[PDB]
Amino acid sequence: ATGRIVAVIGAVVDVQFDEGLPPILNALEVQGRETRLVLEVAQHLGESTVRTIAMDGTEGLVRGQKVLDSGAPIKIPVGPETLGRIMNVIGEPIDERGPIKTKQFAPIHAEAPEFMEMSVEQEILVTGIKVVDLLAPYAKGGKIGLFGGAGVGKTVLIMELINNVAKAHGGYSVFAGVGERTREGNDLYHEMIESGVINLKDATSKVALVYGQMNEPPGARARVALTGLTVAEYFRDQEGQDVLLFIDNIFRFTQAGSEVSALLGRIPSAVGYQPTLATDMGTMQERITTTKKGSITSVQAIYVPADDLTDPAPATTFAHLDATTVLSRAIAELGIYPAVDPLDSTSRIMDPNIVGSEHYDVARGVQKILQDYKSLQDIIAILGMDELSEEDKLTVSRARKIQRFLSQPFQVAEVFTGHMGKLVPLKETIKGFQQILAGEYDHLPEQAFYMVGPIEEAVAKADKLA
Amino acid sequence: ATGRIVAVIGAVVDVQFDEGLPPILNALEVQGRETRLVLEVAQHLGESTVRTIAMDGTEGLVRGQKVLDSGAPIKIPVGPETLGRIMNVIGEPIDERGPIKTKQFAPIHAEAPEFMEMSVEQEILVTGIKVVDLLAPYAKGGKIGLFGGAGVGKTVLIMELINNVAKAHGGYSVFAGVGERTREGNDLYHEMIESGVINLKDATSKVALVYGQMNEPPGARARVALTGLTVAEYFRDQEGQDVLLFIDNIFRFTQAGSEVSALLGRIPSAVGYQPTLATDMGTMQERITTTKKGSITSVQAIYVPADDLTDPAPATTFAHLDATTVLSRAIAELGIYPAVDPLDSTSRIMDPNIVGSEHYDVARGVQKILQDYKSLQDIISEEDKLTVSRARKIQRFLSQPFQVAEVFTGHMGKLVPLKETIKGFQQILAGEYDHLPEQAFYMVGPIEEAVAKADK
Amino acid sequence: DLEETGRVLSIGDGIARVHGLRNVQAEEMVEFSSGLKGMSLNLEPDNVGVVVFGNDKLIKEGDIVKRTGAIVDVPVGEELLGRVVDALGNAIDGKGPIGSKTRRRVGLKAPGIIPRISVREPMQTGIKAVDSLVPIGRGQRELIIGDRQTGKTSIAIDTIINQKRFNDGSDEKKKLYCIYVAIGQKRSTVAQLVKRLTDADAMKYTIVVSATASDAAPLQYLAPYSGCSMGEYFRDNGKHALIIYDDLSKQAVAYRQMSLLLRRPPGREAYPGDVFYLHSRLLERAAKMNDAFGGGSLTALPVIETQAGDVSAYIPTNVISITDGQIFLETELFYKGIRPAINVGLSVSRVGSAAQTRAMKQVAGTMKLELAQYREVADAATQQLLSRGVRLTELLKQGQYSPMAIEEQVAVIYAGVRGYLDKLEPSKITKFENAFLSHVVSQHQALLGTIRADGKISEQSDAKLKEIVTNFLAGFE
Amino acid sequence: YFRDNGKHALIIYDDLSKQAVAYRQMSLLLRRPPGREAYPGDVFYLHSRLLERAAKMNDAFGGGSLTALPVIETQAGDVSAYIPTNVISITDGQIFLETELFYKGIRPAINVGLSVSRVGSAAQTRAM
Amino acid sequence: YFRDNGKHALIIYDDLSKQAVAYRQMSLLLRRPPGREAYPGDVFYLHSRLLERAAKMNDAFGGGSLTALPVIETQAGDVSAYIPTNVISITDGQIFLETELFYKGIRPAINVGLSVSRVGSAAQTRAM
Amino acid sequence: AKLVRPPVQVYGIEGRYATALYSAASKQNKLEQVEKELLRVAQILKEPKVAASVLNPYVKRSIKVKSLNDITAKERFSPLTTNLINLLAENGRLSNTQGVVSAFSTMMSVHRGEVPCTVTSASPLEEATLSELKTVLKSFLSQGQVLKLEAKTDPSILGGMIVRIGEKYVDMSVKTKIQKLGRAMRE
Amino acid sequence: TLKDITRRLKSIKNIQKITKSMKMVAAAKYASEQSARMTAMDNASKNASEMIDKLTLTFNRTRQAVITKELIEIISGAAAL
């Protein structure tokens, strides 16, 4: 079927077909373009007209231009031939190494796994970060979400999880960049080339990359997450592997939906967001799940507008995640890094029957003492430190020591801090926090715990203080 | 061009023209009324219809009433014959003294001067007021936020600025009463008549008034500031002077703009202010500048809604303010007049690259000694008492007898130039007058008169 | 004719509905009969919504609107250097017509992943605080964020002035062409800034795009893109370009106005839903191109004004999430006389530590660590730490319009962090540094020249520096 | 009428907030674009053109007078609302009553610190 | 069904905030007029005609009952929003959970101060 | 392009198309022709066949406008009427046609000077007094008018007569009389 | 939240003026420990005052946000017709 263009509003194009009106979610090609421009059908406006979301820039479009229905959704090449490449939203390789010669193509729109396919195994995933492993431990196959405002350390944390987990990984790995810095994508591509994970000369690459970044129009930013999902879904279903899916950033999917919903003629909901925010996020996030035919461990960065953690987008995302790590700016401005908030991060495996009663008691004690210190904050601020109880002074000292200890230097953060990155096993973390709780270090200065590895390095630094 | 009123909704009138639509911002005269009612065009609605805001009340308008296009924006009469007179948003004399017999008119909607007409160096405007010239100088061609309201001698400071600028620089002044209470408008009119600023009997008046009061439709309260600015623009361009333009109040100008937009049905922005808040304020303020002919220096009374400086209206007018003059009531209770707060009054030309290293050094020294004086007064020794003595003498020397008050206290008027102010505060800070009594500086001119009074 | 011509149906709200133009393209520059120009924004089944690049007053209903056939573009090239143009590339300095022969679309896309390469070359700002603790490399996006009247435009002007020592040299690989886009500032401010740059003789390699406060909101919304295209020209030809958007808060305000006069759903603080894309597509075009594309780069210094020091607002956080760092200018620090009032505790450059020279790194790692200790403390050692930190913060203070070469800065920071000032009075460090620099530029041109050429501090140069600063310090007060 | 024919009147609007509410309903039902708190764009115009008619004339016009005492009913001291802010901006002062003073024994519960008269001393006999 | 056959049931909606969000999407897409937080006008009707079906029948109808435990998620403890106030005003008492009590070691983190049971002691065994 | 507005105005899309056709006809002097052909094409579009066809919301716009152009072109339409038809059609405003025609008819009801006036009384009148009343209410008119009487009868006014001539309105009925009596005797 | 912000700001105002009263009382009883109490309560009052300024900034921010949100609700409810 061949239609013509009757309306162009930014990234939303209304096209009127004569006969053969394409169903919803089909891909359309615009004729007369230097590069490929795909329009995805979103509505049927009646009178043989449909509304579409463009997948690239829409400048130079003229009313009356031809459009050919492809007869199928946006299909992207899937398979092992996609490892070590970089594709955009519509599946074209943008790494300038030639076409992706894979055998089959999959559509980016698919139905979420059913109920009887869901798997409920909850083995722990040791990352090597003290705060994450202590208070909000991740799980294999679970969904991880890294909340945080602008400039608090989401990207550094994702690079650390790629360094600690995506390197020692057995299965495959997908990284879908959704509306973020392009130089970060270039740096990741080259840092993966050098480390042998992406191997440009033979067929032993272990990572596939999809990239629609913050320079792309809202259609590409809205559907590149779905493209990455499609790649990971192939690696999970058709090969039974264990996949890792790093999404950064997934708030841009909702934000692009919001940027297009104004033009699609819809009444705005709360905070200007689209009325279909929750169901869009649901039909996206329900595909990112570990079935019983495979497993997908997902780490999704999640921006937080104006540091508002009650904004509809993160507040809706919270329900979709198995473990949340909420970075805080009030903590990053204390110099603590990672800026994880120990009193806002949760996990579904923080249960004494899973992580062991000992790990559970340690985590709960840390959280309780930090919460008591947070309650004392105002008194300490106004009436000074010297008007507290002796037990309260003990808890304040221990809690500040625990605050410093929860920080840790990263192997990827050495470039702009110098310190050597540490990787603290779970046992060392549990032991060190048992010891700080028991008060076995109330003689060292708190400054000894700032930016160290395990507790041995803490006491070594405390000695070096003299 | 003759059109006809097709719709009346409060202060918004839709007028349909058969041929020859008027461009946006033109003035239209409603025919067949007892008093002149001018509609200003705001949109072209289509079908040869335009939408307009009324400058006066719309009681007694009928659909189909004739309307005449004037072919130009609201043209007010400009000239030196405007001095001492009062006019409204459309230039009609509301002082009941007959027509304003000028030779030329001017549209209130003009463009800001070109880039090639600006002055490339900032220079100080000497107001002859010691505290204003020392601690918070006024930039020639800049905007000054005048804080503080009642009981702090604000109108006295206004009249003294008018008088000093007229005597020293030979440039007149305009006073735009945007959103005035009519009681306070009349009070200010009569105070200006008494203090000689206005002269109802000869041709030697110093200020021209323009009033749009609190009880006019929002279009009038929005455009009265442009009317006053047009009078001042004439004085700057065609006379080549250093004009002053007082704007009381500017928050009421912002509010009139917000109301005008809300009447036209535009979607409101943040905190309810018009979507075009920044551009309204910009197209107003970018006319108050220095050119290769003269200059316009604007003093604007700033009201801060809910005492919040992050509110969009202050935050938007602050971007254009080059200086600040804070009148405090505590500094008034201490008998200091002008009651200008010395530490809170700031400036943007207090810069050695502009005022020179000498002036900047003396002013920084005075600021430092006053700050340390407050620090010491927190307590209530060796030289702390010497700083206290010099700071008390500084406080006393900041005061000054205003000529606009000669009729009250009999004391003479003192217009202290910049050189003698600099030198006097330099000598008071150098310690040259550590022996004179602190009361020998209260209400004096230069330091010479201070030592003269110290004799007695 | 209703295919290359239209009639204005309805003007008002800064948008002109036009009937006709069946052959117009999206984002095409149409021309009104008033002499004005505009962009074809909305193409609807019966009318075309055109954004007007000027005053609506100049347009009546029924005016004929011709199309140019070109997507909105600006004239680029080296003929712009030393010219003050408006957001449409027209000379507003009365120096004749812009002799440009090439044009570039303002709405282009940023280079992808492959055409880029990591930032490696230094971009010398001339400010000790920036060059030492917040290093900026060619190809970065460093955000200058702070309150009103805290020193942002002054930092940008100091950078543009500092590039003079390179733009007179020999190797075309170190030269940097500067562009200063002014978005909603007072026009007198821009005139005085142009004069200040003409005195410092930094106009011969600078362009100034001015969409001031009295220009229509579409002009303030378009000016950043005109500037970024004038910079992309240099970037795509192996040359290096710096660009300063001063500032982006006022462009965001202009875009919010344009969006509300178009009746689009306002979001947080009444901002449109796409006030992020607005900036992102603009700041992603500042990139470092690899050698297979020319080796050129484009550095962006976006400026952001915060209200009451609040950095967690909407637009500030957007730009923090777009750029590659920030430079926090505090107002309390600016009040106490610290100038430039850079909060070195919150300022950061994620991709700059790979752009410092060897010598500046040698001194600046040390300096950063002692300043970190000094800041976290505020015993017998912590008193030494506070003393050294006070001396170093007094060493970071700097004049205005006097940027320092890299060798002078590394020499000063060396004299500072090597302990040779631990006995002097804090209030005298400034004059000590001034006199020290005068002495070193007088009697130590060879040491400075070899630190420059080497880009590093060898042990011979280290010893020379030690005995030089000790000879000067002994012969001091 | 009295004010213009030489006599001295006094008028108490009890109260202006409910007149504003009535105008708001009228404007919303006449399909006029709402503003802050749903009030029309010109409720300040309403109250200011009502209140500026309370003047004090001169001997060349009759010497009459018309004192207005507009009343405003806030909600928990909320003088930062829309209509209270407008009427405070238009008037020549205020008399702030309180519920805390009304309970702590002060009746009339006039708050002396917040209350003000911009004319003040000019409107008193010499003894007072 | 169980309520009408002498048997006792207990239903738990988890939660009603998401049902209200789904209904708000359906309404805003059907072009119905939005209210607070863009919710439709009759979401209170939506929750009330559901929660009123929980009743205790008398012995002339079998004696069966139906207990309901609706769940509500507030944003940062804002129980003054639209849907939280609706469902609080509908039900017979709340069970407030806090996160500061949850991290102070109090688990279940029930805030006993704000938790009400309008039925009260009539819903307890004698000993308890 | 200057337009000639009719003496009375109709609004909505109805009135917009009506005044567009009025001006397009008065610019080439075909008011009567387009008027009669409008009423006849309204009769044509109300025959159940095409009257049903024309509102069916899925019939293609191009196919339906060409079908209607075929059907109208056989009556020997002048170009202005078929232009109006094709404009209403490709603009999808066909269901409004008759309404527009009605407007246009009433349009001409003012071009000929036809002033509609009602004289309603208790019970139907005999045409001797009705003729002298035609004379009486034709007396107030100006130069060059024709009048249209539409009298209706209602015993609810229980006497008198009501003359609603255009916008002028005299109520000499005994109902208003007794209401005046009551309001006066109570006040 | 506007009301919770007023709650916390009233709490801090309470303890602020409490330490003010206790400072002036301990300064009355100053005619060693009493002088220390005077200075400590002075510092506590200045701390509570700076916290009051912080809370006032936050309160003004939240007030602007609330007004903007209610305006958006009103205009989006009116614009659906």
Ligand SMILES: Nc1ncnc2c1ncn2[C@@H]1O[C@H](COP(=O)(O)OP(=O)(O)OP(=O)(O)O)[C@@H](O)[C@H]1O
């Ligand atoms: N390092 C400095 N030394 C001396 N003066 C300085 C310094 N930095 C800034 N200033 C002064 O502070 C004043 C304001 O600084 P500047 O205008 O450059 O920053 P800004 O943030 O752009 O201000 P605005 O918000 O008005 O645009 C200037 O007049 C300048 O002279």
Ligand SMILES: Nc1ncnc2c1ncn2[C@@H]1O[C@H](COP(=O)(O)OP(=O)(O)O)[C@@H](O)[C@H]1O
């Ligand atoms: N582990 C860390 N150590 C030190 N600084 C860090 C660390 N993580 C983040 N940061 C700080 O955050 C900045 C980058 O964080 P990033 O993840 O890129 O922010 P965003 O959430 O916007 O992506 C760095 O410049 C650094 O200053």
Ligand SMILES: [Mg+2]
């Ligand atoms: Mg990130």
Ligand SMILES: [Mg+2]
């Ligand atoms: Mg600036």
